[PDB]
């Protein structure tokens, strides 16, 4: 079977492309505590019918570009903006982490 992931759209600033943040939980190898991680996947959409703060579902596909290997299957839930601003604030905190 082909791998299927679920995440929230966090970007639409590209032509026929969206950025999906896939969320994963797993127990730590050593300390046993359940650890939560995330990864960003560039997904292909020809219809531009997906927007920011949309919970979508992706599938493994043949390569489209250098970083694109996934297509969008189905919209699950819409308007989940909270995750989007969470990601944006986490990303925006970086400017305050510089040295110079």
């Amino acid at each position: 079977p082909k791998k299927v992931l679920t995440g929230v759209v966090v970007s639409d600033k590209m032509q026929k492309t969206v950025t999906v943040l896939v969320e994963r939980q797993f127990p730590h190898p050593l300390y046993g505590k359940v650890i939560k991680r995330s990864k960003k996947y560039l997904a292909h959409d020809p219809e531009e019918k997906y927007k920011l703060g949309d919970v979508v579902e992706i599938i493994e596909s043949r390569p489209i570009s250098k970083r694109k290997r996934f297509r969008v299957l189905r919209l699950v839930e819409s308007g989940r903006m909270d995750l989007v601003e969470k990601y944006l604030i986490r990303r925006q905190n970086y400017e305050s982490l510089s040295k110079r």
Binding site: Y31, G32, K33, V34
Partner: protein
């Protein structure tokens, strides 16, 4: 704030036991009462009942001790010597059927929250299921 109710209940039981009280009160909960019934069945506590305290649901626990000892320090031997909490918030402990611990060569009990209700180690082994490891008592 209060982060762990079950750990709180264990600590309350331990503290009341160490001072040889006849009774202790803990805020009421289904999970707590299940743990209490499991403890009572194995004969670790005299009994429990649901009481009402100032318009709030409470569970009153009756503690059990041994006979008054001879010589200096005549305080009775405890029935609950040691009660730890295994799976804590921030580190959950899960065990399979093959990984259910044996406590004090079966002189103690390990209480599991299995898919088929809250069971002891013995019942969990017999039924052949695992779950969150709550506490060990001996």
């Amino acid at each position: 704030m209060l982060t762990d109710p079950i750990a709180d209940m264990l600590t309350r039981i331990r503290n009341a036991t160490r001072v040889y009280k006849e009774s202790t009160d803990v805020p009421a909960s289904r999970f707590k009462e299940e743990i209490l019934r499991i403890l009572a069945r194995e004969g670790f506590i005299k009994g429990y009942e649901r009481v009402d305290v100032d318009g709030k649901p409470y569970l009153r626990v009756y503690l059990k001790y041994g006979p008054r000892r001879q010589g200096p320090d005549p305080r009775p031997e405890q029935v609950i010597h040691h009660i730890r909490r295994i799976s804590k918030p921030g580190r959950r402990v899960y065990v399979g059927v093959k990984e259910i611990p044996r406590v004090r060569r079966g002189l103690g009990i390990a209480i599991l929250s299995t898919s088929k209700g809250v069971l002891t180690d013995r019942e969990a082994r017999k039924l052949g299921v695992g779950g969150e490891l709550i506490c060990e008592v001996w």
